Amino acid sequence: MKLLVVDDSSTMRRIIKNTLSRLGYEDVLEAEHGVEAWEKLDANADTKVLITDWNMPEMNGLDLVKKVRSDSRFKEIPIIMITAEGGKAEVITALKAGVNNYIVKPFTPQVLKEKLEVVLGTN
Ligand SMILES: [Mg+2]
Ligand SMILES: [Mg+2]
């Protein structure tokens, strides 16, 4: 279960990576921006799950998701968006783009653990 976690917040990347570790998901690659994330996916198509935010310079998460879904290798990759964009217009936009599970920031570490366990369980 190779995961890629994309967020331009260093503290958020830490929280997510620690939470995944608590759930037994130890094989985690990070990215700060969409460009870097895409490069990593394109070069490591064995990646199993994409976790991404929305707002960030160097390609945002909506465009990253669109790009992922248009690639023949990633038609079925699970995509979790974790974002402060809590409005339903934005949720709808992201789901149309190919996001499968939407988690809205902010959260305590315990809440994130509960919400990720809902989608990924433990490993
Ligand atoms: Mg962001
Ligand atoms: Mg936050």
Can you offer a commentary on this structure?
This protein has 123 residues and is of the alpha/beta class. Helices cover 44% and strands 17% of the residues. The protein is built from five helices and five strands. Helix 2 (34-43) packs parallel to helix 3. The structure holds magnesium ion (2 copies). One magnesium ion (MG) binds at residues 12, 84, 105-106.
Order of helix and strand elements from N to C terminus: EHEHEHEHEH
- Termini separation comes to 8 Å
Tell me the count of domains: 1
Helix content: 40-55%
* Small molecules in complex: magnesium ion
Provide the structure class.
alpha/beta
Q: CATH class, please?
A: Alpha Beta
Task: State the major sheet.
Answer: 5 strands, parallel
CATH topology label: Rossmann fold
CATH architecture: 3-Layer(aba) Sandwich
Q: How would you sum up the global shape?
A: globular
Which band does the percent of strand residues land in? 15-25%
**Quaternary organisation of the protein chains:** monomer
Tell me the name of the CATH homologous superfamily.
Response regulator
Beta strands, count: 5
Strand order, biggest sheet? 2-1-3-4-5
How large is the count of helical segments? 5
Radius of gyration (Å):
13 Å
Helices, strands, pairings?
Blueprint lengths: L2 E4 L3 H13 L5 E4 L2 H10 L5 E4 L8 H9 L9 E5 L4 H10 L3 E4 L4 H12 L3
Parallel strand pairs: 1-2, 1-3, 3-4, 4-5
This protein binds magnesium ion (MG) (2 copies).
The site of one magnesium ion has 4 residues, from loops.
Task: Summarize this structure briefly.
Helix content is about 45%, strand content about 15%. The protein has about 120 residues and is of the alpha/beta class. The chain has a single domain, classed as Response regulator (Rossmann fold), CATH 3.40.50.
